[PDB]
Coordinates of C-alpha atoms and ligand atoms in Angstrom, one line a residue:
Chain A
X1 CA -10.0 1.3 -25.6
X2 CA -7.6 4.1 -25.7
X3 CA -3.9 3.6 -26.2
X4 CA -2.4 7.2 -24.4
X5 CA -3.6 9.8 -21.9
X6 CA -4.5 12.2 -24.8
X7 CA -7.2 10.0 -26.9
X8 CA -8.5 8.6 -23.4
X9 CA -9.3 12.3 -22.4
X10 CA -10.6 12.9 -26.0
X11 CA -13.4 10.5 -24.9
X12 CA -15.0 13.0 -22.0
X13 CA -16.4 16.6 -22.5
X14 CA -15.1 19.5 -21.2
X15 CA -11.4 18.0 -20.7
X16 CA -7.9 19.1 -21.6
X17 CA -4.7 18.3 -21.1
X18 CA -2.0 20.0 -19.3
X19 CA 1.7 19.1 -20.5
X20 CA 3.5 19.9 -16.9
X21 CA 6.6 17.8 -17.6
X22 CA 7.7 18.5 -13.8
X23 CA 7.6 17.2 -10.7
X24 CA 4.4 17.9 -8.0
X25 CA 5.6 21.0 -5.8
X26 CA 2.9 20.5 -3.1
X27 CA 0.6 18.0 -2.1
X28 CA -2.5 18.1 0.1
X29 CA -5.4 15.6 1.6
X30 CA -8.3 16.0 3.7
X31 CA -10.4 13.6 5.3
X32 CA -13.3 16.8 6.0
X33 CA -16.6 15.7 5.8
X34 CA -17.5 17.2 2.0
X35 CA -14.4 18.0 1.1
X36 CA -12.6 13.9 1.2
X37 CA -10.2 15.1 -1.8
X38 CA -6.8 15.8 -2.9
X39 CA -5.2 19.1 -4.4
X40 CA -1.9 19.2 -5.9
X41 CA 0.1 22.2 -7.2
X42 CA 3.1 22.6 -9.8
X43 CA 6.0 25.6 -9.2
X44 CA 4.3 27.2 -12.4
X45 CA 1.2 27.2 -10.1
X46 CA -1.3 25.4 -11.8
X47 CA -3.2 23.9 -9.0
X48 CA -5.7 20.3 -9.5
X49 CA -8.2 18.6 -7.5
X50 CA -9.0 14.4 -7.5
X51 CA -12.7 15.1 -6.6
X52 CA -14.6 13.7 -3.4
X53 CA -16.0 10.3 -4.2
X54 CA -20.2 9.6 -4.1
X55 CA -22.6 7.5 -3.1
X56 CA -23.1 7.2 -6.6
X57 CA -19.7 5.4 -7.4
X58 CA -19.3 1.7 -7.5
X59 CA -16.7 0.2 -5.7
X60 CA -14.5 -0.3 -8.3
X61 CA -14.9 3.4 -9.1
X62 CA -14.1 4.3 -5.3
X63 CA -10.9 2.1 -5.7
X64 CA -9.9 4.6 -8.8
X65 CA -10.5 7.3 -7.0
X66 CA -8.3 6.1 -4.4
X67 CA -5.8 4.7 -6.7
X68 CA -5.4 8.1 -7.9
X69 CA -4.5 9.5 -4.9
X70 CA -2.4 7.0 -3.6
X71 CA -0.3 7.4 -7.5
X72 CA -0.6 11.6 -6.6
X73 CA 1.2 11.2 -3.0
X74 CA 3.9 8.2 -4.2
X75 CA 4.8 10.7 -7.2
X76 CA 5.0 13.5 -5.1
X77 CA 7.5 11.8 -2.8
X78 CA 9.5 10.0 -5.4
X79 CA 9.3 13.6 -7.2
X80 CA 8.3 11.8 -10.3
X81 CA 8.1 13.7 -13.5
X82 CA 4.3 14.3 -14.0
X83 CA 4.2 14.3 -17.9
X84 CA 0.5 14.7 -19.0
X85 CA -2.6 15.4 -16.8
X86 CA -6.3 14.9 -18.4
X87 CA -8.7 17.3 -16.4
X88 CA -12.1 18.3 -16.7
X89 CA -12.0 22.3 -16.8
X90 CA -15.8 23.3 -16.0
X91 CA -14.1 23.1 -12.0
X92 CA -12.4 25.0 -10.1
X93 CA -9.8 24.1 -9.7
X94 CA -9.3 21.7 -13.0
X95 CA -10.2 18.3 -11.7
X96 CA -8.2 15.0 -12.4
X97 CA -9.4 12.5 -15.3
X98 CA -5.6 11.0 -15.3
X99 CA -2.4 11.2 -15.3
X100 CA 0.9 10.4 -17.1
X101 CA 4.2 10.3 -16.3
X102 CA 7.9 9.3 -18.2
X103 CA 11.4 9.9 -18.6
Chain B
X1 CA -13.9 24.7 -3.5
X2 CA -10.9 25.1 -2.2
X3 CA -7.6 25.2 -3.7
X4 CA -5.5 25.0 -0.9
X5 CA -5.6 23.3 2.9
X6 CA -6.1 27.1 4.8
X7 CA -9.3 27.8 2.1
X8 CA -10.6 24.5 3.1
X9 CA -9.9 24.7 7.2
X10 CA -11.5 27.9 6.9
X11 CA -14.8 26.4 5.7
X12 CA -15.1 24.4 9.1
X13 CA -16.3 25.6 12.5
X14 CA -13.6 24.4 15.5
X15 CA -10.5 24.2 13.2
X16 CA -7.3 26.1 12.5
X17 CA -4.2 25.9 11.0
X18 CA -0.5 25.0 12.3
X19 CA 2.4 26.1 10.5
X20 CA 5.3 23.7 10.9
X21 CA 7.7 23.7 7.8
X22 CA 9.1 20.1 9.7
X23 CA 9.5 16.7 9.5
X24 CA 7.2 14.3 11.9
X25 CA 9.5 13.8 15.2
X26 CA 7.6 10.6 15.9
X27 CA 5.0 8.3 14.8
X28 CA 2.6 6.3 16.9
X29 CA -0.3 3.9 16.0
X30 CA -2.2 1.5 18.3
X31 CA -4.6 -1.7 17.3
X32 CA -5.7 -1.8 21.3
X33 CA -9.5 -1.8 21.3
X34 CA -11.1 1.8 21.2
X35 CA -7.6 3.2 20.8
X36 CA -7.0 2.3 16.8
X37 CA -5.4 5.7 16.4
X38 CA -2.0 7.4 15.2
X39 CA -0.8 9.9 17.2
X40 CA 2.4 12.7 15.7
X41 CA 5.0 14.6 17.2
X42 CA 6.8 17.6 16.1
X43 CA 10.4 18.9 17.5
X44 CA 8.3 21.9 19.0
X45 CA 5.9 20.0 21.1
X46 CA 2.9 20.1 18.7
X47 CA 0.7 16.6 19.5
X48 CA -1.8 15.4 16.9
X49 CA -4.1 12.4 16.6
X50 CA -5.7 10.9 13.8
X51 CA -9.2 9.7 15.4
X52 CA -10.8 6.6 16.2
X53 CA -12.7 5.8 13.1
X54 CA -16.3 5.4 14.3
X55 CA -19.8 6.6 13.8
X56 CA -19.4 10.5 12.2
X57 CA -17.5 9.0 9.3
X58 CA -19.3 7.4 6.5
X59 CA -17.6 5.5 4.3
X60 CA -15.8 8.1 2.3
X61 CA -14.2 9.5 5.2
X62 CA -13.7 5.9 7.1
X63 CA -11.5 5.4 3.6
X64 CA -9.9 8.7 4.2
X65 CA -8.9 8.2 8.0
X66 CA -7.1 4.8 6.4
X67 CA -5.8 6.8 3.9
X68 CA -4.7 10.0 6.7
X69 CA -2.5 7.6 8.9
X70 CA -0.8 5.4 5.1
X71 CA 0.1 9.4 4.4
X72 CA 1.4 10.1 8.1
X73 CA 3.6 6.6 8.1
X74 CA 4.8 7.6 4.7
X75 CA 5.8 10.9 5.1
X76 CA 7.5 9.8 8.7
X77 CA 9.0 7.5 7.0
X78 CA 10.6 9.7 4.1
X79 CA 11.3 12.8 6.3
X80 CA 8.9 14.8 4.2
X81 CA 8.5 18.4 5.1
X82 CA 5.1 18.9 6.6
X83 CA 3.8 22.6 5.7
X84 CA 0.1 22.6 7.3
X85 CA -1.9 21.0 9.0
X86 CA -5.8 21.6 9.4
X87 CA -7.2 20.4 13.0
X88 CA -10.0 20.6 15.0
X89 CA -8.9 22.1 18.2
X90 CA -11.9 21.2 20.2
X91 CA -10.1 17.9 20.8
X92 CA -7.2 17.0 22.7
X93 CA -4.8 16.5 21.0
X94 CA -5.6 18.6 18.5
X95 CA -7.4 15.9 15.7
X96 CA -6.2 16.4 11.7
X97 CA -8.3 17.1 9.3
X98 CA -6.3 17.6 6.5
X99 CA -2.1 17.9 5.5
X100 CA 0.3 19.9 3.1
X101 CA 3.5 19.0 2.3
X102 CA 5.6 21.0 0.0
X103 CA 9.2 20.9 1.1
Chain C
X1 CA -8.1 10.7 25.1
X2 CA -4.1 9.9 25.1
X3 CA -1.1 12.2 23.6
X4 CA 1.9 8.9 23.6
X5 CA 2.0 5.7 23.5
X6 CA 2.9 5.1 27.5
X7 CA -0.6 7.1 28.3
X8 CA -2.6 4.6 26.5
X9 CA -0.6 1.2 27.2
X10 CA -1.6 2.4 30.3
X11 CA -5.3 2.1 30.0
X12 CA -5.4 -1.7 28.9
X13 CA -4.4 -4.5 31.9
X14 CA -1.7 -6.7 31.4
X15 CA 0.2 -4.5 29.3
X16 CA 3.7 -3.0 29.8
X17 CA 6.2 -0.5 27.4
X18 CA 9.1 -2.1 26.2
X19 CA 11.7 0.7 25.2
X20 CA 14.0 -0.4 22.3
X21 CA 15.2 2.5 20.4
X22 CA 16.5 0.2 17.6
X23 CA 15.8 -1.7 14.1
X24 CA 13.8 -4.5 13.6
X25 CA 16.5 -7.2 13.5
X26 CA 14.4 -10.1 11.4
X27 CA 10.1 -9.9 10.2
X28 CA 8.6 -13.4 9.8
X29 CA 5.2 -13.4 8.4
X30 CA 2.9 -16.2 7.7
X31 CA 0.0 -17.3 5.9
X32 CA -0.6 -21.0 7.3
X33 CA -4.1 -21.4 8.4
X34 CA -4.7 -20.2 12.0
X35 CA -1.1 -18.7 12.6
X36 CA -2.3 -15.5 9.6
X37 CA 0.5 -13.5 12.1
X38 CA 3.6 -11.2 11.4
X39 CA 6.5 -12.1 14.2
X40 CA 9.7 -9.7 14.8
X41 CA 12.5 -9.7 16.6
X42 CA 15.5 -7.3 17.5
X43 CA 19.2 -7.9 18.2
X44 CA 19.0 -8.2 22.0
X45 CA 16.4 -11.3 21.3
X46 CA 13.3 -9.5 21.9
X47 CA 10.4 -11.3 20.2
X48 CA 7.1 -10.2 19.5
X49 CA 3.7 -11.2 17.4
X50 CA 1.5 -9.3 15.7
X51 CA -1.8 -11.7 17.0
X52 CA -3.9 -14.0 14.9
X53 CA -7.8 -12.4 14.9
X54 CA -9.3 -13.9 16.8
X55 CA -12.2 -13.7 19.5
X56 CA -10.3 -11.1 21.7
X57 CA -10.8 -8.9 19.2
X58 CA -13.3 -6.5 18.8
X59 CA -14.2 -5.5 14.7
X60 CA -12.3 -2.0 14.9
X61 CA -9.3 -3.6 15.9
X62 CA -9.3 -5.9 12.7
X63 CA -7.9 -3.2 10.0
X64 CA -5.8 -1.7 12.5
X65 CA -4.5 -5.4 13.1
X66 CA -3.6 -5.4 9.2
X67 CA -2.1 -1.9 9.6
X68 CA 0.6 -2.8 12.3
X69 CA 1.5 -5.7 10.4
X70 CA 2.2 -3.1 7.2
X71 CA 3.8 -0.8 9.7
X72 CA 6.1 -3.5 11.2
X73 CA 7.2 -5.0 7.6
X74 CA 7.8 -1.0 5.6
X75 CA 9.8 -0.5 9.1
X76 CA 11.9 -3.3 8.6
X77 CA 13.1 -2.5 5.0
X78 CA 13.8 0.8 6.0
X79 CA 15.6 -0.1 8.9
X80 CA 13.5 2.3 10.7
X81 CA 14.2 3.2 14.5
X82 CA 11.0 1.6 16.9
X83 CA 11.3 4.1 19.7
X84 CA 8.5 1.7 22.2
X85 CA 6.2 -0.7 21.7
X86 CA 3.3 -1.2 23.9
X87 CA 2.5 -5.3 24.5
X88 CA 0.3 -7.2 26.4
X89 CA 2.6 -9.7 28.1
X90 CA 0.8 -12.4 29.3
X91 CA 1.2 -13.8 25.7
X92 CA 4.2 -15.9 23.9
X93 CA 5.4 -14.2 22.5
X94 CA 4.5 -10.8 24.0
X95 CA 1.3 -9.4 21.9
X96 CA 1.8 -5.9 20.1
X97 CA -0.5 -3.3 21.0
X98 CA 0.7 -0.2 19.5
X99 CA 4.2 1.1 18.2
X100 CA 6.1 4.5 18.5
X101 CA 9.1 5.5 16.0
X102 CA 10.6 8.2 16.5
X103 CA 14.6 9.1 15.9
Chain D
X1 CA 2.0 -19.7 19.4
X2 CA 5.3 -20.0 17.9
X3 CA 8.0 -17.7 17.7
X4 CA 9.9 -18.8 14.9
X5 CA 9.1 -19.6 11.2
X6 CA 11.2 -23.2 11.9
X7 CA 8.5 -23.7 14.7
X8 CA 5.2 -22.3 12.8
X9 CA 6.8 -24.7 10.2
X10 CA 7.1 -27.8 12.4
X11 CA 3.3 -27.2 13.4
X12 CA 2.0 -28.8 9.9
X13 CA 1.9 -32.2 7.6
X14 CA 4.0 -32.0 4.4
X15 CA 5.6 -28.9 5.2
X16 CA 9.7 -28.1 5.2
X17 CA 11.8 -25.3 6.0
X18 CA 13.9 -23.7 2.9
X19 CA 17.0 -21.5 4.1
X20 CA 17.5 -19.0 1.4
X21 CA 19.8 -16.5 2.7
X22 CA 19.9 -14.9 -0.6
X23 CA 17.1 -12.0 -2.3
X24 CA 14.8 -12.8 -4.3
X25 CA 16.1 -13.5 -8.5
X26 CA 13.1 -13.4 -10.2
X27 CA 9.1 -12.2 -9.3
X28 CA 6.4 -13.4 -12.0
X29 CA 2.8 -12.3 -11.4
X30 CA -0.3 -13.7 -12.6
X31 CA -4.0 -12.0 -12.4
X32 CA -5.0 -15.0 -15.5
X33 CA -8.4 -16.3 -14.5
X34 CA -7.7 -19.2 -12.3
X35 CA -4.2 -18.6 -12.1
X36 CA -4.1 -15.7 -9.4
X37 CA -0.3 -16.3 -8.5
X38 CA 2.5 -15.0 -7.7
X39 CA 6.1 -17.0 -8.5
X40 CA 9.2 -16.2 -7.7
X41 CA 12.8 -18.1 -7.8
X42 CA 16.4 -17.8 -6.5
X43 CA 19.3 -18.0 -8.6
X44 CA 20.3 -21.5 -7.0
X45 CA 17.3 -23.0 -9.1
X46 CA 14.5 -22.9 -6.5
X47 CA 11.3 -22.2 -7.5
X48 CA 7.9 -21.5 -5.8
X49 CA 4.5 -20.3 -5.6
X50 CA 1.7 -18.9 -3.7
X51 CA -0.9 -20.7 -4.2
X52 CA -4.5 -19.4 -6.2
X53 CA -6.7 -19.0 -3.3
X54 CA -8.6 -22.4 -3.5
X55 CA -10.9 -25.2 -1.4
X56 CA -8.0 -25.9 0.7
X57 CA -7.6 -22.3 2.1
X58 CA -9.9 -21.2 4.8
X59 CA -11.3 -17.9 5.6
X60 CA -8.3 -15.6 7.7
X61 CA -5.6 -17.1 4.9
X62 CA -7.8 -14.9 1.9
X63 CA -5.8 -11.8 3.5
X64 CA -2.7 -13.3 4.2
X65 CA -2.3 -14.9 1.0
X66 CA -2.9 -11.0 -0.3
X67 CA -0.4 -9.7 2.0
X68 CA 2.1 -12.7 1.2
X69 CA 2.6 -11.7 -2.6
X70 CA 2.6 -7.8 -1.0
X71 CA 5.6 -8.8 1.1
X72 CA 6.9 -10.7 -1.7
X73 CA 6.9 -8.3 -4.3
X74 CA 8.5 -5.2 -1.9
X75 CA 11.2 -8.0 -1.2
X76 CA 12.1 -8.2 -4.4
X77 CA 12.2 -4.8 -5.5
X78 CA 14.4 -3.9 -2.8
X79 CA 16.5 -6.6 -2.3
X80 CA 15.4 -8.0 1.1
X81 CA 17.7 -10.9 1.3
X82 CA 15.2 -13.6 2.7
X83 CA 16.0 -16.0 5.4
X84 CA 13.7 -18.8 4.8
X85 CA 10.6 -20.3 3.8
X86 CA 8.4 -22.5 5.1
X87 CA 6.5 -24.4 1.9
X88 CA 3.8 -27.4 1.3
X89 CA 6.4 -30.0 -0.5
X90 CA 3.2 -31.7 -1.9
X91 CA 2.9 -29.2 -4.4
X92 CA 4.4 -28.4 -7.5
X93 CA 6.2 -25.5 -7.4
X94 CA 6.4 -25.6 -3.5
X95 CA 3.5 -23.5 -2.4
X96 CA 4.7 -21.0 0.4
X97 CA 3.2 -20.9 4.2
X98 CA 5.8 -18.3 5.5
X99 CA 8.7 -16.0 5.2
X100 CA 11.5 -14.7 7.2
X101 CA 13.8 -11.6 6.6
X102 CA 16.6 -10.8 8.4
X103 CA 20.1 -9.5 7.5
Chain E
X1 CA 1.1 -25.6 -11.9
X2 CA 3.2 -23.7 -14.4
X3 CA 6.8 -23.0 -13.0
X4 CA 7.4 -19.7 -14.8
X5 CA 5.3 -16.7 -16.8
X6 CA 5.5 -19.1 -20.6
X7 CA 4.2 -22.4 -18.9
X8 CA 1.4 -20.0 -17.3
X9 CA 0.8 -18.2 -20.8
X10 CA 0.9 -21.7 -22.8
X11 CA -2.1 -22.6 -21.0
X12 CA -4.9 -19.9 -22.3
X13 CA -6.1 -19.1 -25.8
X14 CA -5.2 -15.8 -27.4
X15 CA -2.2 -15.1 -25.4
X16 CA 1.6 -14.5 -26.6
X17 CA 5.1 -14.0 -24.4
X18 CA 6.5 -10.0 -25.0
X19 CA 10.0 -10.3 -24.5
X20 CA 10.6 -7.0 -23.0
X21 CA 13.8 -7.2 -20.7
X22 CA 13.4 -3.2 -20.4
X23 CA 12.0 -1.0 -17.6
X24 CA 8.5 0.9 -18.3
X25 CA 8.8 4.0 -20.7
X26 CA 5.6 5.5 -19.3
X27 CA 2.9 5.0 -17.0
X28 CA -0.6 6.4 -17.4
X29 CA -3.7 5.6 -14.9
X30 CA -7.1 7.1 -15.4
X31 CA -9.9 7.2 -12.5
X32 CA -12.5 8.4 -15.5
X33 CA -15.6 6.6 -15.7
X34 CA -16.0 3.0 -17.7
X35 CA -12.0 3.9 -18.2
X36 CA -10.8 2.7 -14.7
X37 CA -7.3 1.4 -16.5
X38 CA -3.8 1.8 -16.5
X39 CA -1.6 1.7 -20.0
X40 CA 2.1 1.0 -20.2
X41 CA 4.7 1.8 -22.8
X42 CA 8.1 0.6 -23.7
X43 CA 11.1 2.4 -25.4
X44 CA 10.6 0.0 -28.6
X45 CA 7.0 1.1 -29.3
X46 CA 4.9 -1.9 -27.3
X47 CA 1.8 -0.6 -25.3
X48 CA -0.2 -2.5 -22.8
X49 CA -3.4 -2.4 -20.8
X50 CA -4.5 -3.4 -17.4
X51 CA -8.4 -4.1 -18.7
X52 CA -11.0 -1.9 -16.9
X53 CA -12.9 -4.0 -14.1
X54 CA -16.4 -4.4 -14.3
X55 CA -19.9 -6.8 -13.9
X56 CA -18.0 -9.8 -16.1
X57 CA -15.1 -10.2 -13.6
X58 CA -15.1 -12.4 -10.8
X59 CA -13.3 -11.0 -7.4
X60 CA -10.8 -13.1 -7.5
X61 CA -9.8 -11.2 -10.9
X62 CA -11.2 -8.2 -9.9
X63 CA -8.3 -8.2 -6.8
X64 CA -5.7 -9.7 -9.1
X65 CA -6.7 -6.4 -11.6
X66 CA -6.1 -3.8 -8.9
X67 CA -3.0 -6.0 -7.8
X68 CA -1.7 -5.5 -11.8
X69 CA -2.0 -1.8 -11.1
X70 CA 0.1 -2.0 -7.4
X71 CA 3.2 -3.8 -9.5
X72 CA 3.1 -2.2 -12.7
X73 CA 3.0 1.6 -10.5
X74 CA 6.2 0.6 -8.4
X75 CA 7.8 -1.1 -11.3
X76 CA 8.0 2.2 -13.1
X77 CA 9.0 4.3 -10.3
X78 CA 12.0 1.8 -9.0
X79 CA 12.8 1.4 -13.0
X80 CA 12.8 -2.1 -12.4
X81 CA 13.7 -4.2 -15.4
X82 CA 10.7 -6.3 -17.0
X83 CA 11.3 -9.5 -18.3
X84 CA 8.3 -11.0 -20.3
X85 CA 4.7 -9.8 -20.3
X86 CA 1.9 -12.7 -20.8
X87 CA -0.7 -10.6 -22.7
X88 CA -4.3 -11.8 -24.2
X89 CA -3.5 -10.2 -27.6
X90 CA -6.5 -10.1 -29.1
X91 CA -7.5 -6.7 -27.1
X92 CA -6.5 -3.4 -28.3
X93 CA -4.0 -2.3 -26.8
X94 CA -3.2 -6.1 -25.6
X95 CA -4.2 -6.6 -22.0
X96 CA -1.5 -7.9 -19.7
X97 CA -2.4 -11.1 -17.9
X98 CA 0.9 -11.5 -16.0
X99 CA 4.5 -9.9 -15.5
X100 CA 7.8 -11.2 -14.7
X101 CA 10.7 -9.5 -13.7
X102 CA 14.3 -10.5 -13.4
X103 CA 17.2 -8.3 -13.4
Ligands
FUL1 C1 -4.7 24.8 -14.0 C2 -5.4 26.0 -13.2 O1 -4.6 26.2 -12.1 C3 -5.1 27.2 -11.2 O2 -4.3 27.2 -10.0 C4 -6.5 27.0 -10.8 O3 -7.0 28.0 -10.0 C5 -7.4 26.8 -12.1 O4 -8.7 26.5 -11.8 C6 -6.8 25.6 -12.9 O5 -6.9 24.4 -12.2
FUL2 C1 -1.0 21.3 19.2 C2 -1.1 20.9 20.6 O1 -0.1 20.0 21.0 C3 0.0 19.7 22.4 O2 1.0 18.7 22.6 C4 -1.3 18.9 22.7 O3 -1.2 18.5 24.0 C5 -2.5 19.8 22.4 O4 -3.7 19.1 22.8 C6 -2.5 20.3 21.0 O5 -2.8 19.1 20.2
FUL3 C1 7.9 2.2 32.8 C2 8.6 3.0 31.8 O1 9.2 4.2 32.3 C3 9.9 5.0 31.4 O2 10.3 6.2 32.0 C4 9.1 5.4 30.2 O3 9.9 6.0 29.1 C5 8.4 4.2 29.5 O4 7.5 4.6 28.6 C6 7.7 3.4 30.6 O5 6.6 4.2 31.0
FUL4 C1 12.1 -25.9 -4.4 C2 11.9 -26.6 -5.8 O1 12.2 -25.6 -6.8 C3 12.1 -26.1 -8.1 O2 12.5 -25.1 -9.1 C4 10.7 -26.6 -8.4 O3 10.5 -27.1 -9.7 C5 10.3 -27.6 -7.4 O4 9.0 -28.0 -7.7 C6 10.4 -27.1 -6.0 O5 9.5 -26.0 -5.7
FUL5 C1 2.1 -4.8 -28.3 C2 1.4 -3.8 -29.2 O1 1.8 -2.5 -28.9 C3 1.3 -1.5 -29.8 O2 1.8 -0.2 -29.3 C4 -0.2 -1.5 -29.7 O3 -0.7 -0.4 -30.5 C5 -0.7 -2.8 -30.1 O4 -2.2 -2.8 -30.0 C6 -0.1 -3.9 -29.2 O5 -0.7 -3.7 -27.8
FUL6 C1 -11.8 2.4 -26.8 O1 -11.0 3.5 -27.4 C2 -11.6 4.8 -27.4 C3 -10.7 5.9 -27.9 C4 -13.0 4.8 -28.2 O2 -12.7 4.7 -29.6 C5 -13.9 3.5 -27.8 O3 -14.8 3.3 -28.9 C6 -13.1 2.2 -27.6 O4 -14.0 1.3 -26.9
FUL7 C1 -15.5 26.3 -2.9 O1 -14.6 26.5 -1.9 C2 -15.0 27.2 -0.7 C3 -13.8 27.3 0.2 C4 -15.8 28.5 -1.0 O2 -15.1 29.7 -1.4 C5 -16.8 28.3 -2.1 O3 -17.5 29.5 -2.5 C6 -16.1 27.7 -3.3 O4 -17.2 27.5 -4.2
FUL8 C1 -8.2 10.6 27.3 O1 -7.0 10.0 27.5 C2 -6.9 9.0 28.6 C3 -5.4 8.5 28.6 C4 -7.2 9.8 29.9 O2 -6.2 10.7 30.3 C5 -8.5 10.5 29.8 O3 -8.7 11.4 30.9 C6 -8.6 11.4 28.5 O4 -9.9 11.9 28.4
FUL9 C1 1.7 -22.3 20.4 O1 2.9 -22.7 19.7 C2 2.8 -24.0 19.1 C3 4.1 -24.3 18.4 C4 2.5 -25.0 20.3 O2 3.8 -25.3 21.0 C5 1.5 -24.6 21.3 O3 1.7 -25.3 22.6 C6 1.5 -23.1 21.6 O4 0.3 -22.7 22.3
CA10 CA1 14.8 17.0 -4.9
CA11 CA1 13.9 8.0 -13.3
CA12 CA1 17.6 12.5 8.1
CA13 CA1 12.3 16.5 -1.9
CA14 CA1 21.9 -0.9 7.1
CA15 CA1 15.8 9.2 9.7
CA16 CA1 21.7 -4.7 -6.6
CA17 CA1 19.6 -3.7 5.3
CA18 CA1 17.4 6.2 -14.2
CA19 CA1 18.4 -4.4 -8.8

């Protein structure tokens, strides 16, 4: 079980982590057929995605999915400091693993 | 993929984009049978539904239409900026499909 | 399909718009068995239930009945203006069909 | 149908009304195998629960009993003064039926 | 029925009281496969797990997981103060069975 964001994206191939220290600067969601995701930005311009969910997630998967977009809009309006983000970077855009935030 | 809501409306046939840089005027949702919808209002006129959920949305996008109108009552709510939105236009009011926010 | 919430209280019999263009004064909620229900009230004595399910209800209507009852208690605490409500009033206390903010 | 907690209250054996008028002093929260609680207390000493769901509850109070600890959490963290409570006195702590905010 | 979170902890094997009274340092979710978790972190150094769900949990704790998340999210974004943690601490990092907060 990992204890941070770092060694917990350590665990998956084809990952990295961002250090954004800043807030979210935009925030988007679609309820599209396909395309049920979530893209945020940063000012710098990095731009992420929280892929669409499958048939082949569990629920309790779907409800991580979801968590993680519910965490991405409540940060965006409480312009939390986004710390860390774990990505997988074979996408494009750089798709969300997790997420950190402090200070 | 896309890495923004105008890349993503543009993949659909029947949509297009609004600009409003605004805050939602108002804020309606209904429980009456047939009718579980929220509808939006801008200053300028602009009238948008989220739809009934029903039979074209499997279970990703029945999630999503939940998730569409907890975003809409949020962002009300916290007089967030609206940037875009994505709607199909061959419905009256025009239906959303997806949101920006970036104040 | 309606744009506001006087066009679709408008479809359902026994229903009337109450216009109150003020905060929710006091939000009761219970979990006693057969009164699961959320009543609210505003300063001029108004009084009104979110309804038991029950056998009225069609299945759509069941999250949406859930949704109004988050609606009405995140309005409350944020002392948020209710433009209208739709009710059906041949119910005590009158029986909320659908809400407008707007302010 | 009532339209009052005091009422809703009066409805049931071995219940009593509390009257608070105070916010919430402390929120405990339990996810311990059969201890799925919440508890919280106000600074004049009173204590009480809601109740793991159990034998006693019946089908429409599994969701309210989810929504109660919801309401009761938000309360807290933004210092809803509550009204009252209506509780089971046959339990120790006082398991909760209902709440009312007001202020 | 315990009255408060070291009652409720005095009752399991492998548990201890964390004597926190401090708000969250950090807060890190992951939506990453088998690693559907959040972690904590005070100032002093302490680090804490909300266990990944999976086939051994029941519902019941299943829910009160994904509640764990709901709190420990808006506790670290309203910087609320956290009393104790009860925490099974023979996990590594030691998984949170319940939360209080008083401040
Ligand atoms: C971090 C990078 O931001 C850019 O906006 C994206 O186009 C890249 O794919 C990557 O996500
Ligand atoms: C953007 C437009 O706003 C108007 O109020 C509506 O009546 C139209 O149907 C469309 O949705
Ligand atoms: C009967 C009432 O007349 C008013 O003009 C309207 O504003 C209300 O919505 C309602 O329809
Ligand atoms: C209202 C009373 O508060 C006290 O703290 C509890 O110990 C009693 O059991 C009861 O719930
Ligand atoms: C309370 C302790 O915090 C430390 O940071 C962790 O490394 C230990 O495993 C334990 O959870
Ligand atoms: C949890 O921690 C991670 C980093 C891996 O070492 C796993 O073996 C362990 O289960
Ligand atoms: C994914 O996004 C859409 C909008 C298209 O440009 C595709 O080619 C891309 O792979
Ligand atoms: C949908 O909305 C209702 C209120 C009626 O005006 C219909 O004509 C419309 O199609
Ligand atoms: C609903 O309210 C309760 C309190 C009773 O008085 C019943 O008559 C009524 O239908
Ligand atoms: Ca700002
Ligand atoms: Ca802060
Ligand atoms: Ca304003
Ligand atoms: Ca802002
Ligand atoms: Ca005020
Ligand atoms: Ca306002
Ligand atoms: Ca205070
Ligand atoms: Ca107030
Ligand atoms: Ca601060
Ligand atoms: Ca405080």
């Amino acid at each position: 079980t990992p204890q941070n964001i770092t060694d917990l994206c350590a665990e998956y191939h084809n990952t990295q982590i961002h250090t954004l220290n800043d807030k979210i600067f935009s925030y988007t969601e679609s309820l599209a057929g396909k395309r049920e995701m979530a893209i945020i930005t940063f000012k710098n311009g990095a731009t992420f995605q929280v892929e669409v969910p499958g048939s082949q997630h569990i629920d309790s998967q779907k409800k991580a999915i979801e968590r993680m977009k519910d965490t991405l809009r409540i940060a965006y309006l409480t312009e939390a400091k986004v710390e860390k983000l774990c990505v997988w970077n074979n996408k494009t855009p750089h798709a969300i693993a997790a997420i950190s935030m402090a200070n």
